[PDB]
């Protein structure tokens with residue numbers, strides 16, 4: 001189904017079809033680390049969590065992080081046999097490509113080399129960003145996990161105006177659901193489920209299946225397998241509580257929810273294993 | 275990166291260094307945008323990464339195609355489809371005799387189709403001007419230069435301010451709106467539409483305030499009735515002079531009744547009321563060019 005209202009600028013079913021048709025172009029592989037036998041799934045969690053903290057220090061948007069995560073996962077699916085010391089360069093260069101794509105005033109190249117504690121040169125990043133974009137066939141416009149949550153939050157708070165392009169939803173509950181998604185993305189087995197399924201399953205845990213289906217278009221049976229897998233991650237967030245909305249210097253409050261945050265979520269990821 | 279022989283330099287600007295190349299074996303001609311990577315401290319430019327990724331997913335008959343992206347010798351070559359002339363050079367060559375009305379309608383119809391394809395894919399062009407509209411010798415016209423383009427989300431957020439070349443910049447941009455989307459491209463096409471009719475630019479301003487006053491002098495100084503919320507916009511001033519809206523019989527004399535109606539809806543002050551590209555295709559101005567499809571009531 002399609003949860004978008006009537007769109008004045010295009011056929012509502014045409015815009016939704018294109019968004020769904022793109023998700024078939026961008027492939028995921030929850031077992032791409034079998035192509036890299038020396039790597040372990042936890043190394044990916046430590047890398048992505050480090051990129052989250054880097055994003056918060058430079059106040060990069062959540063969309064920028066999930067672009068880097070998607071660039072990292074799809075690039076490793078094209079490569080074979082990668083060492084641990086090569087992971088930091090691939091991750092920081094994926095964030096460099098993502099920051100230049102998403103931010104209005106992105107950080108400079110030397111700042112991306114600066115946060116690596118001197119382990120990645122500015123020219124090492126330039127070499128890596130070319131290899132990443134060429135290996136991905138320059139397909140660098142995916143619908144991230146966090147971009148779907150933005151769609152689901154807009155339709156949930158829609159009025160009779162049906163103006164789907166002007167944002168209007170509570171920032172408080174948005175960062176709470178994003179907090180659940182930031183934890184689940186550290187686990188590699190999330191790639192089994194499409195990005196749109198993952199976001200709808202996290203919204204369901206903070207609301208209901210009626211609101212989920214109203215704003216995502218997916219029936220309960222489409223997300224049941226994902227909801228059951230997201231079960232341990234949801235309660236870990238419920239046991240510790242929902243985080244508060246942060247204010248960031250230089251970032252307007254009407255955009256403060258879009259800034260990537262970071263907690264010590266690596267401890268919370270291990271509790272979701274049992 | 276062989277088999278291609280440079281034939282003529284097309285130009286150098288914000289896009290980059292564009293050459294006209296010709297395949298020696300097949301006789302095929304392309305346009306080569308060359309990017310010297312050794313002179314780019316920040317690696318591949320952000321405008322280059324955006325345009326490549328957007329054009330690799332915007333395959334349409336009215337969009338200049340990106341054919342290949344070759345990287346060699348610290349150079350990044352973008353291979354484009356070649357068209358022999360831009361619209362501005364065509365309008366200048368047609369300034370004396372005028373562009374025939376069936377050709378203006380055919381060109382605007384094709385431009386709206388390419389823009390509707392962009393907006394349905396959630397992509398703003400944000401630099402629609404005659405220099406970026408390319409024509410071939412087979413009656414077609416295509417959108418070019420997506421370096422200033424951006425994919426917008428649903429919902430959108432605050433994007434880059436002061437976009438679009440000044441003559442084709444929508445009034446909501448000039449007044450400093452926080453959010454914007456597809457309406458800014460329609461305003462540009464409305465200016466290009468009238469420019470094809472009158473053979474001169476519609477609002478040729480030399481500053482932000484002069485561009486806004488030229489719009490006010492033709493369409494009238496907007497108020498809360500014609501544009502709700504205009505008096506609260508950041509760059510709005512109560513000291514704006516009060517000009518009366520001019521009769522479109524004088525603004526675009528050659529345009530008939532259906533033409534003035536479509537142009538008015540493309541130049542509506544309110545971005546929420548401004549006609550969309552898809553709806554403009556269904557306007558009675560193109561009722562002789564296109565025929566409607568049956569609509570499933572389900």
Ligand SMILES: CC1(NC(=O)O[C@@H]2CC[C@H](c3cc(NC(=O)CCc4cccnc4)n[nH]3)C2)CC1
Nearest residue numbers: 284289305354355356357358359360405418419
């Ligand atoms: C360059 C620009 N900006 C841009 O980004 O255009 C992209 C990049 C190159 C691609 C392109 C351009 C093109 N024809 C022309 O430019 C007409 C001018 C000319 C002059 C001499 C010999 N022949 C042709 N065919 N294909 C698409 C359009 C403004």
